């Protein structure tokens with residue numbers, strides 16, 4: 001297959017692979033920020049994703065108020081505009097649901113998860129350049145899935161028949177990402193992402209580990225997400 005010159009090639013190949021897939025009830029709507037938030041997504045890939053990296057963080061899929069708005073993984077609006085310096089054109093997905101509107105950089109909801117993750121990175125590293133010198137953050141699946149009533153559907157809850165071709169496409173993009181960036185360690189943010197990384201990357205010369213996911217759905221994340229993750233990283237051998 002084609003040579004992957006960079007992350008943007010990889011994301012474009014992924015979007016193409018995704019565009020051929022079908023999803024059905026209870027999926028009613030599928031959002032692909034790789035298409036509607038392409039300019040800010042490619043900004044993030046091009047400004048911060050130059051190879052090599054030592055460590056790759058991998059999330060699961062966009063939150064409605066983060067990457068679905070900005071094109072950036074865990075991409076809370078404020079942190080993407082203020083810290084990363086990215087603020088660009090975001091159009092609305094085909095069939096946008098009214099309970100999950102894509103206002104882009106005008107979105108006024110703050111995503112907790114990405115606020116916590118990027119805020120901790122900002123606190124530990126100061127500038128983006130000190131972080132991205134060694135690290136990167138990507139999602140395994142760039143799509144957001146909703147029911148007809150606008151409810152989120154995580155990719156683990158898709159019917160197997162539709163899940164398998166989705167995961168095949170996402171695994172291929174992940175392997176391509178790892179061959180380009182050459183990290184020593186790939187870290188799933190949460191259990192689902194961790195399990196996909198072990199599945200996709202077996203036999204590569206990389207270690208795979210996990211950190212706690214920053215969402216309020218975990219008690220430890222509310223008490224001390226940063227201290228917890230900082231411990232996990234240290235147990236993995238990762239300097240943060």
Ligand SMILES: O=c1[nH]c(=O)c2nc[nH]c2[nH]1
Nearest residue numbers: 059060061063073074113
């Ligand atoms: O890009 C993202 N990936 C994730 O897994 C996630 N979880 C919450 N918010 C998120 N953003």
